[PDB]
Design a protein around this ligand. Structure first.
Ligand SMILES: [Co+2]
Ligand SMILES: [Co+2]
Ligand SMILES: [Fe+2]
Ligand SMILES: [Fe+2]
Lengths: 314, 314
């Protein structure tokens, strides 16, 4: 009715239920998998995603929002198979994930041409299917807001204005890329309440995080388990502080888990050190119980995982 | 034997015949094509490649070397189809084409892991087929020798020392990247005679061009027709001067034509302005006749287009 779902009829935002706002079923580099397929195994990848999703559902997760887009190996037909096997509500997205420059395809191409690609995914469908994009994903990281990064941001604003789908971002918590994404998007006419600034939970700099929330956007405390960015304990402490300071209606929580990911950083012998407890269920095992025994009312849990995602997609 | 060909038994390097050392059957950004297939037309692309190759063969071209690798949309099965329809000898390669950073896949991966990918293509086959790579292609441009660019250059050296296949490079004629590529490769123990420093025809600075030939590598006067980089008549005067100065033993000539290319810069609109006479038969129409009118004999032409490619692959 409003939010398109992979392999399902669209639904009203009020029916989204308990939601994980940022989780990846599978991530890979398009060019590498295309050039060297021997490196990948789809059977395992599907099995890994299906199993992970089933664990999440057993904890009550009703909807998963998967911001895998161009540059992370979005594959709508893979996503269909996971839904087919699990029955999860899956929201797919459109957009471009870059840190520095766009692919050469985009040389001498306008921001409008880029926005047109996103709009195609939202109105027509993804990768030749009738599965439609429910949001736009954009990124910026250590390199900052480069020329191409900015062009992609402004294209996302155009797509939002045309289709009203919200925007999810990837940012670096330590260099103000998040605040800049927000500024540019809102200058382009995007409603601040239609923006989730991502990976802000990677820092304990509470003052910076509040600055984005005060400007009306959702803040992504969304990498629970990725200790190399910030340990779980510190994340919980920051989350609790924000809630106590009255920021629960701006907070969104997730793991940014990748059921399978091809980056060398994700090698098995690195897990114990970088992300020992990383998964899509960590928050049920740690974060939520922690909050409840620290004076946080159930109503606040309901706000973060149900109400906020609802408003976001409304 | 010696040189592996797409869709054919390998051949002796002595039987390579008249060769175009740098031409592309098709170029595209892997990620863009994968995410937005609606932008592309396989049937038209095949038609374009087939017809162009046939025109080259009518002018005596026996072998085409196609340096389309990761980052340029290498597709071995598409290459097979063109071979079947034309009968051309086609040499495919392996390697990586980047200007700044490697794909995220390579985060926390060694230069050895990279080399292993090249050696896989050379020894086992490309993209799950039995078509083997006959050379390694690497690149550097305006941004210069970045850390990741340098990593790829060294992996190419490993692949060459292991398998003996030659290396073809892409460089920017104005920033010393070509000379730097040659230095790094030779320091790694690569035979200079197994290196083609590419795109040197983009400049008329013969002092710089000669510096590379003097160190033992082939020089790529390889973008005939691409006037936006350097107009035909200027390339001709440079080519002629080099021959007159005795450098025909290091000279290689080609067009770097792309029968189909998805970059905005290559739109049909811009062709008349940026590269009006660009194609795989330009050197037969203009360059070769021009050299002959200026006293260059048949032997020199045979040296450039038959003998040099032979040495390169020996
Ligand atoms: Co991210
Ligand atoms: Co090139
Ligand atoms: Fe993510
Ligand atoms: Fe080329």
């Amino acid at each position: 009715m409003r939010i398109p779902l992979v392999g399902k009829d669209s639904i009203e935002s009020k029916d989204i239920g308990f939601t994980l706002i940022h989780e990846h079923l599978r991530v890979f580099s398009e060019a590498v998998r295309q050039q060297w397929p021997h490196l990948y195994n789809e059977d395992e990848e599907l099995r890994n995603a299906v199993n992970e999703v089933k664990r999440a559902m057993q904890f009550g997760v009703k909807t998963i929002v998967d911001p895998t887009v161009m540059g992370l190996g979005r594959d709508i037909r893979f996503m269909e198979k996971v839904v087919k096997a699990t029955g999860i509500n899956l929201v797919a997205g459109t957009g471009i994930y870059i840190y520095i420059d766009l692919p050469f395809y985009f040389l001498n191409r306008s921001i409008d041409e880029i926005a047109d690609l996103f709009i195609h995914d939202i109105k027509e469908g993804i990768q030749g299917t009738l599965n439609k994009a429910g949001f736009v994903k954009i990124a910026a990281d250590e390199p900052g807001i480069t020329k191409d990064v900015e062009k992609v941001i402004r294209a996302a604003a155009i797509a939002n204005k045309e289709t009203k789908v919200p925007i999810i971002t990837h940012s670096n918590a330590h260099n103000n890329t998040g605040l800049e994404q927000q500024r540019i998007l809102t200058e382009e006419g995007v409603d601040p309440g239609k923006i989730l600034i991502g990976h802000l939970g990677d820092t304990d700099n509470i003052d910076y995080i509040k600055k984005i929330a005060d400007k009306g956007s959702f803040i992504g405390l969304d990498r629970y388990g990725l200790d190399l960015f910030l340990p779980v304990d510190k994340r919980n402490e920051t989350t609790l502080r924000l809630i106590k300071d009255g920021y629960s209606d701006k907070i969104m929580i997730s793991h940014d888990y990748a059921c399978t990911i091809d980056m060398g950083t994700a090698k098995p012998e690195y897990k114990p050190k970088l992300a020992p407890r990383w998964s899509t269920t960590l928050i049920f095992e740690d974060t939520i119980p922690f909050l409840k025994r620290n004076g946080v009312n159930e109503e606040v849990i309901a706000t973060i995982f149900k109400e906020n995602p609802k408003k976001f997609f409304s």
